[model samples]
Target: AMSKVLVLKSSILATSSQSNQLADFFVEQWQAAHAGDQITVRDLAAQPIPVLDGELVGALRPSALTPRQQEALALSDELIAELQANDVIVIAAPMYNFNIPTQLKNYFDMIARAGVTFRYTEKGPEGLVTGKRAIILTSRGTPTDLVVPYLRLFLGFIGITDVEFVFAEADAKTLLAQVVAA
Candidate 1:
């Protein structure tokens, strides 16, 4: 059972969002199985973070930041800390124009910090975050799904290898079964 779970909802549809509904279904079952486990929900569509910019870069640099830079840096720090605290991460993504929502992408930009989430090495760039599991719930209109591959690549870049993707066809029961088996 997961001790800490972070649910990231990127769809703007909220209760009507298929991806969000599926993710919520999994979370409910997970909580039922592991009573009192921690679950933190981050609704990115409702509260979108600023896109990566020069000010944000300055904040990440090893120098004093201006007031605006400090604010952005603080937000990034909080997002990173939340990710680091969670052992399991559930992402609800609805395909929009063959890609992930802008809100989710912005959140990713905030968390992918050099020397924090990942670091440069003599060999190459190495991801520092590890030993975490991820479940991605995607709602797609087209048969050709592009979301899974992108998610796999991005998560792997951050050293999260144990990742799974579930499509809308898989009902809550199927998801529950898979979670139980895992």
Candidate 2:
């Protein structure tokens, strides 16, 4: 069976971001090995998703749903569906001001829905979106290295606990760039 791979690009630098560059190399290598698999890329930096606001939250409760709410709901649905459909998720999350870019955070907000991707159980909150894995690629670091722990927590909350990070421990773009190039 072929795997559905989802690559999320959230670096504002786009063409020049180290994380995105590394992600592209990883994808190229993956494609070479899994030639038959289906791959999808979501470049969030180009078109950032909206922050979940009060008006949109109302859309979830109940109402005729303003046309705008309808639109937001549709986007949320599509994002969640896209996540569930993929077997592997790759996030190119460049660190920004000690954390991740706003675009990536908004992407997470758009997909985390109660009783859908996750739910509350008697024991504790349980993730419904199970049996999937995710990889996070980042460029640079410092000031706490919040990117790794925060990302792992979120992914685990959604049952994508099988997560890995590539930071090079030296120069993110330097080491792996050569490795992949070679």
Candidate 3:
């Protein structure tokens, strides 16, 4: 079914960023493939993810929360809500070294929660997030990469098992641009 989509755009370079450009590619292709579906793009670099800290760790505690902590919880809940409300999640993940960008990692920290996005089960561990698909638009910006493996393991742990990866090769990045245009 053509359904609501959430696009997580995390590139420090903003509009000109290769990964951000990939985000745009997905938007254009999505509109072409399913014209009536909804898409919401959230730029982590623009919005800025709050660093996880003690306040956020204790956000659900019975102790009265300070206004700052209350706001932190609100942001966390908002991110999780946005994640769960979508049928498709498009992640624009450009690698920084061997990891995803700091902002993108922070975005994950904000959303992945015990008994919320994921839970410990007698079966070992279980990801609570389910019934959704993810499209990963990734680039290494270098020659080698570890991003895909990390994404596969991490996304699978969160129940986003249905995933497709589109990477423009260090030498082939522009190839998909043509494909996307087509």
Candidate 4:
């Protein structure tokens, strides 16, 4: 059973977001099953995070930085810590024009710290954040195929290969049922 869960919703529609609704459905069932489990909800649309820029990238490096850079890097550190503390992460991400929202990407950028979340080795890059699970809920206006693949690639890069995605639409109900059952 998951002891701590993090729910990330980036849909701009707020309460009406389909992805958010699906995530909520899963979270409710999870809470019912695992009483007193901690759930952290991050509504990116309601409170958007600053986009990743050159300045933030500079701060990520292990070198002396100005006070401004230190302040900027602190947020990323907190976000990374949250991911590290969670057993499961439910991402409610709606496809925007064929990709994820800028906010979600920014979130990823913050967490994907080299030598922290992942590391470079003689073999290749290895993920450090292991044994965690992720459930992604994606919504599209029309039939599409790119979202899930992209998510898998990105999440896998961070060692979160144990991930499942619910393609919202006719299959949303069935997908969510399976997730809850698991």
Clashing pairs counted in every model: 0, 0, 0, 0
Query: TM-score for every candidate vs. truth?
Result: 0.90, 0.88, 0.86, 0.91
Worst ten in a row by lDDT for model 2: 173-182
Candidate 1 per-residue C-alpha lDDT over 1-182 given as tens digits, one digit per residue, 9 for 90 to 100: 53899999999887888777776777788887777789889999878889888888888775567899989989999998899899988888778888998889999888888888888899998787798888887865545687788889888888888997776755656865577457
On lDDT, the candidate that comes out on top is 4
State model 3's lDDT.
0.81
The regions of model 3 sitting more than 4 angstroms off are 60-63, 140-144, 170-182
Evaluate residue 47 in candidate 3 and report its C-alpha lDDT on the 0 to 100 scale: 94
- Tell me the tens digit of each residue's lDDT in model 3 across 37-131: 99899999999998877877787443478898889888988998999999988898888877898998888878877778888888788887799
Clashing residue pairs found in predicted model 2: none
TM-score of 3: 0.86
lDDT of each: 0.83, 0.81, 0.81, 0.83
> Every model's Cα RMSD, please?
2.2, 3.2, 3.3, 2.2
TM-score attained by model 1 = 0.90
Which of 2 and 4 is the better model by lDDT?
4
Measure candidate 3: CA RMSD: 3.3
For model 3 the local lDDT of residue 100 reads 90
Which candidate, 1 or 3, would have the higher TM-score against the true structure?
1
Report residue 159 deviation for candidate 3 (angstroms). 1.4
